[PDB]
Amino acid sequence: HHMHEIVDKNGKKVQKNNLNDEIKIIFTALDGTLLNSENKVSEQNLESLIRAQEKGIKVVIATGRSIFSVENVIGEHVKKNRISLLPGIYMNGCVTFDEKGSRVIDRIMNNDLKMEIHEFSKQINISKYAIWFCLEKTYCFEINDCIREYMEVEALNPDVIEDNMLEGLTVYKVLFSLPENILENTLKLCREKFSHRINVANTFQSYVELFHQHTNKFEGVKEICKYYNISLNNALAMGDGENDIEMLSGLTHSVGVHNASEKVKNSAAYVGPSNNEHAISHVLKTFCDI
Ligand SMILES: O=P(O)(O)OC[C@H]1O[C@H](O)[C@H](O)[C@@H](O)[C@@H]1O
Ligand SMILES: [Mg+2]
């Protein structure tokens, strides 16, 4: 079967003996990549992460999430020091921590641009689907089935606040949890309105995220590699969604998981197993010889 293989653009399996770069560090998306469809770390992945720690391979989360929601999803592994959150790349790079919890990237959204996005979202009536991200907290203006769906997956509940409170908040991103039926059209409106203003990414499903135009996960990758004096050629990135494209195309070694879209796969050097098939375990086997 093809379930567990990693292959190049020609469809040929990647062989360790043909690799000339040691992989010292792995950057991975969380939902859709490391976590299976139940948002759990499979036992096969966990076993391989334990071996990677024994061998001194660093595994770094790179996610649209805040560190707070990451801790709520994978906390049991963090508590056992099986997955480290520091260093880590959060809010699509706009908050990137070194191992001391210091932000080596802090990209706040300009406040005028924040209010312009806010006003536009009210004008097209997606404001009710907005989750606004501050450094330590998230906010929404109401609760509906789409906010509910967001909360259940995110596993961290935003505070409900009034409209006029947004002006006083210092924010990094906004995430719209959209109805499927309006996703495609809303994505077009946001991208047309905000090009060369802000990043617009459909990260998973009907979620649309807006965050600092000049920042992305790859900016975090560069900062963390720099920290440890690791050449980019010794780093590997793996991912599934649009917010992974820059880090997949920015590194020579990168793995799109099988469940990723063609656009995401195209940006990656290699295609691996799906997130339900223990992708990082097989990445560790292929690149690091387990
Ligand atoms: O960037 P990732 O770690 O793949 O996260 C992907 C994200 O997709 C959406 O934003 C979901 O609401 C989040 O729960 C999920 O974390
Ligand atoms: Mg993902």
mmCIF file of C-alpha atoms and ligand atoms in Angstrom:
data_model
loop_
_atom_site.group_PDB
_atom_site.id
_atom_site.type_symbol
_atom_site.label_atom_id
_atom_site.label_comp_id
_atom_site.label_asym_id
_atom_site.label_seq_id
_atom_site.Cartn_x
_atom_site.Cartn_y
_atom_site.Cartn_z
ATOM 1 C CA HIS A 1 0.000 0.000 0.000
ATOM 2 C CA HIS A 2 0.835 3.698 -0.471
ATOM 3 C CA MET A 3 -0.494 4.678 2.950
ATOM 4 C CA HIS A 4 2.799 5.292 4.731
ATOM 5 C CA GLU A 5 5.200 6.403 1.917
ATOM 6 C CA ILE A 6 6.935 9.745 1.247
ATOM 7 C CA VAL A 7 7.559 10.508 -2.456
ATOM 8 C CA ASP A 8 9.106 13.240 -4.609
ATOM 9 C CA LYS A 9 7.426 15.202 -7.405
ATOM 10 C CA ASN A 10 8.120 12.335 -9.804
ATOM 11 C CA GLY A 11 6.389 9.915 -7.434
ATOM 12 C CA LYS A 12 9.591 8.147 -6.341
ATOM 13 C CA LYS A 13 10.118 7.239 -2.696
ATOM 14 C CA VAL A 14 12.600 9.375 -0.836
ATOM 15 C CA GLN A 15 15.578 7.273 0.314
ATOM 16 C CA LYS A 16 17.745 8.288 3.293
ATOM 17 C CA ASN A 17 20.980 7.275 1.529
ATOM 18 C CA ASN A 18 20.240 9.776 -1.282
ATOM 19 C CA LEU A 19 19.784 12.608 1.245
ATOM 20 C CA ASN A 20 22.797 14.891 1.749
ATOM 21 C CA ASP A 21 21.273 17.005 4.554
ATOM 22 C CA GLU A 22 20.895 15.968 8.158
ATOM 23 C CA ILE A 23 17.456 17.065 9.356
ATOM 24 C CA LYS A 24 17.998 18.668 12.743
ATOM 25 C CA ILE A 25 14.626 20.261 13.195
ATOM 26 C CA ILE A 26 11.053 19.706 12.082
ATOM 27 C CA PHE A 27 8.409 22.398 11.855
ATOM 28 C CA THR A 28 4.868 21.015 11.764
ATOM 29 C CA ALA A 29 1.344 22.366 11.474
ATOM 30 C CA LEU A 30 -0.932 21.054 14.202
ATOM 31 C CA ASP A 31 -4.502 20.455 12.997
ATOM 32 C CA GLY A 32 -4.589 18.586 9.705
ATOM 33 C CA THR A 33 -0.917 17.540 9.878
ATOM 34 C CA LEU A 34 0.334 16.295 13.256
ATOM 35 C CA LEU A 35 -3.102 15.738 14.725
ATOM 36 C CA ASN A 36 -5.437 13.244 13.184
ATOM 37 C CA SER A 37 -9.054 14.050 12.307
ATOM 38 C CA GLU A 38 -10.020 13.557 15.992
ATOM 39 C CA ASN A 39 -7.403 16.215 16.888
ATOM 40 C CA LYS A 40 -5.250 13.663 18.679
ATOM 41 C CA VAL A 41 -1.634 12.632 18.348
ATOM 42 C CA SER A 42 -1.731 9.012 17.217
ATOM 43 C CA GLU A 43 0.246 6.485 19.260
ATOM 44 C CA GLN A 44 2.547 5.768 16.294
ATOM 45 C CA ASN A 45 3.343 9.500 16.029
ATOM 46 C CA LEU A 46 3.807 9.760 19.801
ATOM 47 C CA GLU A 47 6.212 6.801 19.867
ATOM 48 C CA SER A 48 8.292 8.433 17.111
ATOM 49 C CA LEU A 49 8.265 11.821 18.862
ATOM 50 C CA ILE A 50 9.699 10.130 21.946
ATOM 51 C CA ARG A 51 12.521 8.696 19.792
ATOM 52 C CA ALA A 52 13.126 12.073 18.158
ATOM 53 C CA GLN A 53 13.589 13.594 21.613
ATOM 54 C CA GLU A 54 16.049 10.806 22.557
ATOM 55 C CA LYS A 55 18.043 11.674 19.401
ATOM 56 C CA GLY A 56 17.954 15.446 19.960
ATOM 57 C CA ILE A 57 15.804 16.255 16.922
ATOM 58 C CA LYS A 58 13.769 19.401 17.625
ATOM 59 C CA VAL A 59 10.066 19.382 16.811
ATOM 60 C CA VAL A 60 8.466 22.792 16.635
ATOM 61 C CA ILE A 61 4.788 23.593 16.320
ATOM 62 C CA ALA A 62 3.935 26.119 13.602
ATOM 63 C CA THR A 63 0.303 27.062 13.766
ATOM 64 C CA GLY A 64 -2.363 29.694 13.277
ATOM 65 C CA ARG A 65 -3.373 28.964 16.869
ATOM 66 C CA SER A 66 -2.322 30.789 20.006
ATOM 67 C CA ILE A 67 -0.075 28.855 22.365
ATOM 68 C CA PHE A 68 -2.988 28.836 24.789
ATOM 69 C CA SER A 69 -5.287 26.811 22.557
ATOM 70 C CA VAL A 70 -2.415 24.540 21.540
ATOM 71 C CA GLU A 71 -1.877 23.780 25.233
ATOM 72 C CA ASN A 72 -5.560 22.954 25.604
ATOM 73 C CA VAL A 73 -5.463 20.454 22.716
ATOM 74 C CA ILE A 74 -2.117 18.674 23.313
ATOM 75 C CA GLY A 75 -1.615 19.558 27.003
ATOM 76 C CA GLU A 76 -1.108 15.955 28.150
ATOM 77 C CA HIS A 77 1.940 15.660 25.880
ATOM 78 C CA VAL A 78 3.270 19.052 26.898
ATOM 79 C CA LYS A 79 2.999 18.152 30.584
ATOM 80 C CA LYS A 80 5.115 15.048 29.935
ATOM 81 C CA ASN A 81 7.596 17.190 28.007
ATOM 82 C CA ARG A 82 6.982 15.038 24.936
ATOM 83 C CA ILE A 83 6.065 18.057 22.824
ATOM 84 C CA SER A 84 7.624 21.442 23.573
ATOM 85 C CA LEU A 85 5.658 24.616 22.960
ATOM 86 C CA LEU A 86 8.739 26.811 23.420
ATOM 87 C CA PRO A 87 10.139 27.622 20.898
ATOM 88 C CA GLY A 88 7.037 27.718 18.749
ATOM 89 C CA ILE A 89 5.401 29.588 15.914
ATOM 90 C CA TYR A 90 1.898 30.857 16.720
ATOM 91 C CA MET A 91 -0.715 33.009 14.995
ATOM 92 C CA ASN A 92 0.823 32.142 11.645
ATOM 93 C CA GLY A 93 4.123 33.569 12.742
ATOM 94 C CA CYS A 94 2.811 36.833 14.176
ATOM 95 C CA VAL A 95 3.660 35.485 17.562
ATOM 96 C CA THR A 96 6.831 33.438 17.508
ATOM 97 C CA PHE A 97 8.533 32.468 20.750
ATOM 98 C CA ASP A 98 12.045 31.390 21.466
ATOM 99 C CA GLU A 99 12.712 28.769 24.147
ATOM 100 C CA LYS A 100 12.536 31.439 26.870
ATOM 101 C CA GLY A 101 9.040 32.523 25.824
ATOM 102 C CA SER A 102 10.344 35.759 24.401
ATOM 103 C CA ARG A 103 8.670 36.886 21.215
ATOM 104 C CA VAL A 104 11.240 36.902 18.418
ATOM 105 C CA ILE A 105 8.371 37.905 16.182
ATOM 106 C CA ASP A 106 5.611 40.140 17.419
ATOM 107 C CA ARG A 107 3.438 41.505 14.599
ATOM 108 C CA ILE A 108 0.423 43.415 15.804
ATOM 109 C CA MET A 109 -2.211 44.546 13.370
ATOM 110 C CA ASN A 110 -2.284 48.290 12.713
ATOM 111 C CA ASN A 111 -5.289 49.715 14.534
ATOM 112 C CA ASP A 112 -6.708 51.620 11.568
ATOM 113 C CA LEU A 113 -6.506 48.468 9.478
ATOM 114 C CA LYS A 114 -8.162 46.532 12.339
ATOM 115 C CA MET A 115 -11.155 48.879 12.367
ATOM 116 C CA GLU A 116 -11.342 48.880 8.583
ATOM 117 C CA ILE A 117 -11.506 45.081 8.548
ATOM 118 C CA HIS A 118 -14.055 45.277 11.369
ATOM 119 C CA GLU A 119 -16.261 47.739 9.486
ATOM 120 C CA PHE A 120 -15.989 45.752 6.270
ATOM 121 C CA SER A 121 -16.907 42.538 8.082
ATOM 122 C CA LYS A 122 -20.029 44.234 9.446
ATOM 123 C CA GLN A 123 -20.820 45.562 5.980
ATOM 124 C CA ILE A 124 -20.708 42.077 4.433
ATOM 125 C CA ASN A 125 -22.232 40.620 7.620
ATOM 126 C CA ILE A 126 -19.426 38.219 8.569
ATOM 127 C CA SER A 127 -18.686 40.170 11.782
ATOM 128 C CA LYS A 128 -20.920 37.660 13.623
ATOM 129 C CA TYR A 129 -18.435 34.959 12.541
ATOM 130 C CA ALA A 130 -15.324 36.837 13.755
ATOM 131 C CA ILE A 131 -12.907 35.720 16.438
ATOM 132 C CA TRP A 132 -10.408 38.512 17.180
ATOM 133 C CA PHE A 133 -7.017 37.492 18.636
ATOM 134 C CA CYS A 134 -5.215 39.471 21.277
ATOM 135 C CA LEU A 135 -1.947 38.262 22.681
ATOM 136 C CA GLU A 136 -3.494 36.434 25.649
ATOM 137 C CA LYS A 137 -7.253 36.212 24.812
ATOM 138 C CA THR A 138 -9.758 35.843 21.976
ATOM 139 C CA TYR A 139 -13.007 37.745 21.449
ATOM 140 C CA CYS A 140 -16.248 37.387 19.489
ATOM 141 C CA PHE A 141 -19.427 39.450 19.204
ATOM 142 C CA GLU A 142 -21.968 36.655 19.453
ATOM 143 C CA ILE A 143 -22.428 32.910 19.534
ATOM 144 C CA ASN A 144 -23.951 31.001 16.642
ATOM 145 C CA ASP A 145 -23.503 27.502 15.229
ATOM 146 C CA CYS A 146 -20.333 28.636 13.400
ATOM 147 C CA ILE A 147 -18.785 30.157 16.531
ATOM 148 C CA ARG A 148 -19.832 26.961 18.342
ATOM 149 C CA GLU A 149 -18.103 24.807 15.755
ATOM 150 C CA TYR A 150 -14.981 26.984 16.132
ATOM 151 C CA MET A 151 -15.008 26.659 19.932
ATOM 152 C CA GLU A 152 -15.395 22.891 19.851
ATOM 153 C CA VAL A 153 -12.371 22.389 17.601
ATOM 154 C CA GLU A 154 -10.258 25.258 18.932
ATOM 155 C CA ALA A 155 -10.899 24.067 22.516
ATOM 156 C CA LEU A 156 -10.556 27.606 23.830
ATOM 157 C CA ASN A 157 -13.636 29.813 24.153
ATOM 158 C CA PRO A 158 -13.533 33.454 23.133
ATOM 159 C CA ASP A 159 -15.097 36.059 25.400
ATOM 160 C CA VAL A 160 -18.249 37.660 24.061
ATOM 161 C CA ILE A 161 -17.838 41.451 23.917
ATOM 162 C CA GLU A 162 -19.726 44.397 22.463
ATOM 163 C CA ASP A 163 -18.794 45.849 19.055
ATOM 164 C CA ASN A 164 -17.353 49.098 20.409
ATOM 165 C CA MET A 165 -14.819 47.265 22.587
ATOM 166 C CA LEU A 166 -12.730 46.282 19.550
ATOM 167 C CA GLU A 167 -11.169 49.733 19.248
ATOM 168 C CA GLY A 168 -9.453 49.302 22.623
ATOM 169 C CA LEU A 169 -7.952 45.906 21.776
ATOM 170 C CA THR A 170 -4.465 45.233 20.490
ATOM 171 C CA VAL A 171 -4.885 42.386 18.006
ATOM 172 C CA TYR A 172 -2.742 40.067 15.864
ATOM 173 C CA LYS A 173 -5.323 38.305 13.744
ATOM 174 C CA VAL A 174 -8.961 37.775 13.005
ATOM 175 C CA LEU A 175 -10.427 34.381 12.203
ATOM 176 C CA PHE A 176 -13.824 34.110 10.554
ATOM 177 C CA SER A 177 -15.588 30.818 11.136
ATOM 178 C CA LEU A 178 -17.812 30.906 8.063
ATOM 179 C CA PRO A 179 -20.813 28.924 6.823
ATOM 180 C CA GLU A 180 -19.677 26.668 3.964
ATOM 181 C CA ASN A 181 -22.176 28.277 1.593
ATOM 182 C CA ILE A 182 -20.510 31.726 1.799
ATOM 183 C CA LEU A 183 -16.834 30.664 2.041
ATOM 184 C CA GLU A 184 -15.790 31.022 -1.581
ATOM 185 C CA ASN A 185 -17.504 34.367 -2.117
ATOM 186 C CA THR A 186 -16.264 35.842 1.199
ATOM 187 C CA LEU A 187 -12.681 34.808 0.418
ATOM 188 C CA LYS A 188 -12.927 36.704 -2.909
ATOM 189 C CA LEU A 189 -14.308 39.848 -1.242
ATOM 190 C CA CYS A 190 -11.620 39.882 1.457
ATOM 191 C CA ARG A 191 -8.796 39.250 -0.984
ATOM 192 C CA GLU A 192 -10.001 41.996 -3.355
ATOM 193 C CA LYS A 193 -10.571 44.512 -0.584
ATOM 194 C CA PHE A 194 -7.417 43.770 1.369
ATOM 195 C CA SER A 195 -4.670 42.803 -1.162
ATOM 196 C CA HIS A 196 -1.305 44.399 -0.184
ATOM 197 C CA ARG A 197 -2.926 45.220 3.180
ATOM 198 C CA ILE A 198 -3.204 41.909 4.990
ATOM 199 C CA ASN A 199 -2.701 38.134 4.546
ATOM 200 C CA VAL A 200 -5.898 36.233 3.767
ATOM 201 C CA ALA A 201 -5.751 32.466 4.214
ATOM 202 C CA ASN A 202 -8.300 29.701 4.134
ATOM 203 C CA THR A 203 -6.532 27.589 6.732
ATOM 204 C CA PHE A 204 -8.943 24.721 7.143
ATOM 205 C CA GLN A 205 -12.475 24.072 6.037
ATOM 206 C CA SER A 206 -14.481 27.334 6.088
ATOM 207 C CA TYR A 207 -12.047 29.193 8.375
ATOM 208 C CA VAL A 208 -10.634 32.449 6.955
ATOM 209 C CA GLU A 209 -7.717 34.096 8.783
ATOM 210 C CA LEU A 210 -6.414 37.649 8.354
ATOM 211 C CA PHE A 211 -2.978 38.553 9.776
ATOM 212 C CA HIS A 212 0.027 40.790 9.154
ATOM 213 C CA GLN A 213 0.837 41.007 5.443
ATOM 214 C CA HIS A 214 4.607 40.561 5.793
ATOM 215 C CA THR A 215 4.429 37.686 8.266
ATOM 216 C CA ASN A 216 3.827 33.967 7.872
ATOM 217 C CA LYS A 217 4.996 30.679 9.412
ATOM 218 C CA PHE A 218 8.165 30.723 7.344
ATOM 219 C CA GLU A 219 9.236 33.985 8.989
ATOM 220 C CA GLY A 220 8.992 32.122 12.272
ATOM 221 C CA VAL A 221 10.918 29.164 10.842
ATOM 222 C CA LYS A 222 13.815 31.439 9.860
ATOM 223 C CA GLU A 223 13.966 33.033 13.317
ATOM 224 C CA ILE A 224 13.970 29.697 15.155
ATOM 225 C CA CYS A 225 16.570 28.170 12.839
ATOM 226 C CA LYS A 226 18.687 31.283 13.330
ATOM 227 C CA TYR A 227 18.393 30.880 17.092
ATOM 228 C CA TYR A 228 19.926 27.384 17.071
ATOM 229 C CA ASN A 229 22.443 28.153 14.332
ATOM 230 C CA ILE A 230 20.659 25.671 12.041
ATOM 231 C CA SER A 231 20.973 26.177 8.315
ATOM 232 C CA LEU A 232 17.581 26.118 6.546
ATOM 233 C CA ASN A 233 18.891 23.105 4.587
ATOM 234 C CA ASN A 234 18.901 21.120 7.842
ATOM 235 C CA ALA A 235 15.256 22.017 8.545
ATOM 236 C CA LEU A 236 12.093 20.292 7.338
ATOM 237 C CA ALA A 237 8.526 21.655 7.300
ATOM 238 C CA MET A 238 5.313 19.720 7.082
ATOM 239 C CA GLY A 239 1.820 20.956 6.567
ATOM 240 C CA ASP A 240 -1.635 20.695 5.074
ATOM 241 C CA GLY A 241 -3.190 24.179 4.655
ATOM 242 C CA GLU A 242 -2.737 27.526 2.869
ATOM 243 C CA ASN A 243 -1.018 29.014 5.894
ATOM 244 C CA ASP A 244 1.746 26.424 5.414
ATOM 245 C CA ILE A 245 2.614 27.263 1.804
ATOM 246 C CA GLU A 246 5.398 29.763 2.498
ATOM 247 C CA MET A 247 7.236 27.390 4.854
ATOM 248 C CA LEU A 248 6.807 24.410 2.522
ATOM 249 C CA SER A 249 8.137 26.356 -0.473
ATOM 250 C CA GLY A 250 10.737 28.199 1.604
ATOM 251 C CA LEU A 251 12.565 25.051 2.768
ATOM 252 C CA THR A 252 14.308 22.620 0.424
ATOM 253 C CA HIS A 253 12.897 19.760 2.500
ATOM 254 C CA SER A 254 9.180 19.941 3.000
ATOM 255 C CA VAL A 255 6.327 17.445 3.146
ATOM 256 C CA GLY A 256 2.731 18.084 2.154
ATOM 257 C CA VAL A 257 0.481 15.555 3.863
ATOM 258 C CA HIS A 258 -1.695 13.491 1.564
ATOM 259 C CA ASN A 259 -4.905 15.227 2.686
ATOM 260 C CA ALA A 260 -3.604 18.652 1.608
ATOM 261 C CA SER A 261 -5.004 20.426 -1.469
ATOM 262 C CA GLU A 262 -3.150 20.226 -4.767
ATOM 263 C CA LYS A 263 -2.020 23.865 -4.304
ATOM 264 C CA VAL A 264 -0.451 23.035 -0.944
ATOM 265 C CA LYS A 265 1.088 19.805 -2.267
ATOM 266 C CA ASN A 266 2.559 21.744 -5.200
ATOM 267 C CA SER A 267 4.347 24.082 -2.789
ATOM 268 C CA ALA A 268 6.058 21.187 -0.984
ATOM 269 C CA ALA A 269 9.092 19.179 -2.064
ATOM 270 C CA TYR A 270 7.528 15.843 -1.086
ATOM 271 C CA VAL A 271 4.152 14.269 -0.487
ATOM 272 C CA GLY A 272 3.708 12.115 2.615
ATOM 273 C CA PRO A 273 1.022 10.137 4.453
ATOM 274 C CA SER A 274 -2.233 11.743 5.540
ATOM 275 C CA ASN A 275 -2.571 13.208 9.013
ATOM 276 C CA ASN A 276 -4.578 10.066 9.901
ATOM 277 C CA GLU A 277 -1.646 7.865 8.864
ATOM 278 C CA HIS A 278 1.072 9.030 11.286
ATOM 279 C CA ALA A 279 2.820 11.412 8.920
ATOM 280 C CA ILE A 280 5.518 12.695 11.286
ATOM 281 C CA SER A 281 6.482 9.136 12.313
ATOM 282 C CA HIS A 282 7.219 8.290 8.694
ATOM 283 C CA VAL A 283 8.944 11.631 8.138
ATOM 284 C CA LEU A 284 11.187 10.846 11.118
ATOM 285 C CA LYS A 285 11.924 7.387 9.692
ATOM 286 C CA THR A 286 12.755 8.633 6.206
ATOM 287 C CA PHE A 287 14.760 11.766 7.012
ATOM 288 C CA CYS A 288 16.199 11.056 10.465
ATOM 289 C CA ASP A 289 16.456 7.233 10.286
ATOM 290 C CA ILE A 290 13.927 7.281 13.130
HETATM 291 O O1 LIG B 1 -2.086 26.197 11.465
HETATM 292 P P1 LIG B 1 -2.520 24.844 11.977
HETATM 293 O O2 LIG B 1 -1.770 24.370 13.199
HETATM 294 O O3 LIG B 1 -2.688 23.797 10.903
HETATM 295 O O4 LIG B 1 -4.017 25.094 12.514
HETATM 296 C C1 LIG B 1 -5.122 25.074 11.613
HETATM 297 C C2 LIG B 1 -6.316 25.778 12.246
HETATM 298 O O5 LIG B 1 -7.408 25.785 11.328
HETATM 299 C C3 LIG B 1 -8.500 26.564 11.812
HETATM 300 O O6 LIG B 1 -8.053 27.893 12.102
HETATM 301 C C4 LIG B 1 -9.064 25.925 13.076
HETATM 302 O O7 LIG B 1 -10.113 26.746 13.601
HETATM 303 C C5 LIG B 1 -7.978 25.749 14.131
HETATM 304 O O8 LIG B 1 -8.480 24.945 15.206
HETATM 305 C C6 LIG B 1 -6.739 25.089 13.537
HETATM 306 O O9 LIG B 1 -5.666 25.145 14.485
HETATM 307 MG MG MG B 2 -3.458 22.690 9.265
#
